[PDB]
Amino acid sequence: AKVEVGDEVGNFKFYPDSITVSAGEAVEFTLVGETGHNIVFDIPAGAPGTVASELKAASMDENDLLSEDEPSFKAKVSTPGTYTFYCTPHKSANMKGTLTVK
Ligand SMILES: [Cu+2]
């Protein structure tokens, strides 16, 4: 799947903010615009440790931002369920989306 992160007008959004993928299908986040962003998954409380490792490996580090020099990030989640992801700089601005894995 492909998700655009931000736009050329500097809005703090994922495009689309809701994606449904198959197990193990990579979703490629690509930066659009000059504002840096990243993607970190929320870890469901109560999640088994296998789902928590997977979601952490599918997340960018705190000190990592997509830039014109690193414009994409690829995440793969194979466990069925729906997961929330957000951008750390603009988490306050409701810059978030959902990933449904079938
Ligand atoms: Cu952002």
Swiss-Prot record:
Entry's transmembrane regions: none
Q: Which co-factor is required?
A: Cu(2+)
Molecular function per GO: copper ion binding; electron transfer activity
| Regions annotated as coiled coil | none
Location in the cell reads:
Plastid, Chloroplast thylakoid membrane
Membrane topology listed for this record = Peripheral membrane protein
Q: A single GO CC term, please?
A: chloroplast thylakoid membrane
Q: Which domain of life is it from?
A: Eukaryota
The UniProt record lists the keyword Protein transport: no
Alphabetical list of InterPro entries matching this protein = BlueCu_1, BlueCu_1_BS, Copper_blue_Plastocyanin, Cupredoxin, Plastocyanin
How and how many cofactors are bound, per the record note? Answer: The crystal structure with reduced Cu(1+) has also been determined.
Q: What are the entry keywords?
A: Chloroplast, Copper, Electron transport, Membrane, Metal-binding, Plastid, Thylakoid, Transport
Main subcellular localisation? plastid
Tell me where in this chain the Plastocyanin-like domain is found: 1-102
Write out the residues that bind Cu cation: H37, C87, H90, M95
Q: What does this protein do?
A: Participates in electron transfer between P700 and the cytochrome b6-f complex in photosystem I.
- What NCBIfam families does this protein map onto? cyanin_plasto
Could you tell me which PANTHER family the record lists for this protein? PLASTOCYANIN MAJOR ISOFORM, CHLOROPLASTIC-RELATED
By sequence similarity, the record places it as follows: Belongs to the plastocyanin family.
Q: This chain belongs to which protein, by name?
A: Plastocyanin
* Species name: Dryopteris crassirhizoma (Thick stemmed wood fern)
